[PDB]
């Protein structure tokens, strides 16, 4: 499975520059031609050249949205061949904010599992909130992750793709009535209220993702999956919890039972829990635990 990481706008370009420093391709997209010159990505696309001709360096999301639509054909050609796509506009609230949803819409309408990666903190009248809402509408799964843990999505790409495929199958079948899902990785400083606005009023779920390898991998992966402030409060009171651990041939029943215990003890006593264990060679020595909390 081939992955493509697309940084949109100044923020995404800087994110992409850091992640370059494999089997993952990097694309940089921006309305600002001056900034793409500073991108280290092998694939660069300047979008909306007709639309932005004569303008200066602007911060209008609408220009970015229409810039991406003007260059739709160039974007499809660069994404062609991608199984999964990571789209992020990074720490910026300008054109990239508007272009990034369109890039995801293209990746999605091309049949690639499309993940929106949000590093910019948010919660309502900021441009950040508007962008996050727009991205949410366009992607299969939105994932919120600390800016300093950004390299994890490329470093641990194969386990992450298993987690996003799990979220995809949960949505498709409406497991435990879930119809809307946001993913979390790392020490994301948020509570359900900060994201309640932009999720469906019934069927909303939060998925924590923990990945680890080496010694005490199962314990660490399971604890990271529930260590985010967002999962710590949501897991308490959660009427339902979907728990899955996936590893390679080396995954023992001891590691699987321990991970389940850690999640069960954190969860409510009356919680309706579904436990899953999967032996998947492709993970090699990596472990990934997903914990989906619903029914708040």
Q: Which residues are annotated as a binding site for GTP?
A: 10-14, 94-96, 124, 168
Tell me whether residue 147 or residue 158 sits nearer to Cl ion (CB atom): 147
What is the distance between the terminal CA atoms of the chain, rounded to a whole angstrom? Answer: 35
Tell me whether residue 186 or residue 295 sits nearer to Cl ion (CB atom): 186
Residue with the shortest CB distance to Cl ion: 147
Length of the chain: 296
Of residues 117 through 156, those in contact with Cl ion by CB under 5 A are 147
Looking only at the bridges linking them, the beta strands covering 240-247 and 286-294 are antiparallel
Q: How far is the CB of 42 from Cl ion (least distance, A)?
A: 25
Q: How far is the CB of 114 from Cl ion (least distance, A)?
A: 7
Q: How far is the CB of 63 from Cl ion (least distance, A)?
A: 26
The last residues before gaps in the chain (C-N over 2.5 Å) are: 21, 123
Q: How far is the CB of 121 from Cl ion (least distance, A)?
A: 9
**Binding residue (CB under 5 A) for Cl ion from 127, 223, 280, 296:** 280
Looking only at the bridges linking them, the beta strands covering 84-88 and 43-46 are unpaired
Q: How far is the CB of 172 from Cl ion (least distance, A)?
A: 9
> Nearest to residue 181, comparing CAs of 164, 156, 193, 194?
164
- CA–CA distance from 214 to each of 11, 27, 89 (Å)? 33, 32, 33
Tell me whether residue 149 or residue 223 sits nearer to Cl ion (CB atom): 149
Tell me whether residue 55 or residue 137 sits nearer to Cl ion (CB atom): 137
Size of the residue set binding Cl ion (CB under 5 A) = 2
- CA–CA distance from 44 to each of 13, 28, 31, 35, 75 (Å)? 10, 5, 11, 10, 10
**Residue 264 found at the interface with Cl ion (CB under 5 A):** no
The piece of 70-78, 170-178, 206-214, 272-280 that touches Cl ion (CB under 5 A) is 272-280
What span, in angstroms and rounded, lies between the C-alpha atoms of 4 and 87?
9
- Backbone phi and psi for residue 33, each to the nearest 5 degrees, phi listed first: -65, -30
Which residues make up the interface to Cl ion (CB under 5 A)? Answer: 147, 280
């Amino acid at each position: 499975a081939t992955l493509k990481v697309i940084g949109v706008g100044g923020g995404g370009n800087n994110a992409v520059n850091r992640m370059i420093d494999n089997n993952v391709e990097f694309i940089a997209i921006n309305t600002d031609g001056q900034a793409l010159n500073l991108s280290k990505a092998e694939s660069k696309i300047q979008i909306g050249e007709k639309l932005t001709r004569g303008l200066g360096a602007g911060a209008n999301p609408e220009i970015g949205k229409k810039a991406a639509e003007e260059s739709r054909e160039q974007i499809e050609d660069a994404i062609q061949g991608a199984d999964m796509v990571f789209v992020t506009s990074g720490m910026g609230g300008g054109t990239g904010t508007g272009a990034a949803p369109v890039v995801a819409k293209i990746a999605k309408e091309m049949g690639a599992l499309t993940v929106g990666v949000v590093t910019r903190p948010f919660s309502r009248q900021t441009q950040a909130a508007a962008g996050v809402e727009a991205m949410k509408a366009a992607v299969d799964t939105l994932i919120v992750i600390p800016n300093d843990r950004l390299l994890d999505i490329v470093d641990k790409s194969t386990p992450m793709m298993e987690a996003f495929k799990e979220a995809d199958n949960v949505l498709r079948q409406g497991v435990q009535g879930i119809s809307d899902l946001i993913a979390v990785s790392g020490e994301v400083n948020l509570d359900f209220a900060d994201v309640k606005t932009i999720m469906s009023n019934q069927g909303s779920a939060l998925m924590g993702i923990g990945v680890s390898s080496g010694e005490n991998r199962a314990v660490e992966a399971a604890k990271k999956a529930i260590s985010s402030p967002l999962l710590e409060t949501s897991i308490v009171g959660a009427q339902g919890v979907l728990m899955n651990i996936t590893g390679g041939e080396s995954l023992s029943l001891f590691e699987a039972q321990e991970a389940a215990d850690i999640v069960q003890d954190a969860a409510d006593e009356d919680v309706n829990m579904i436990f899953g264990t999967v032996i998947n060679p492709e993970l090699q020595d990596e472990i990934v635990v997903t914990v989906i909390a619903t029914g708040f």
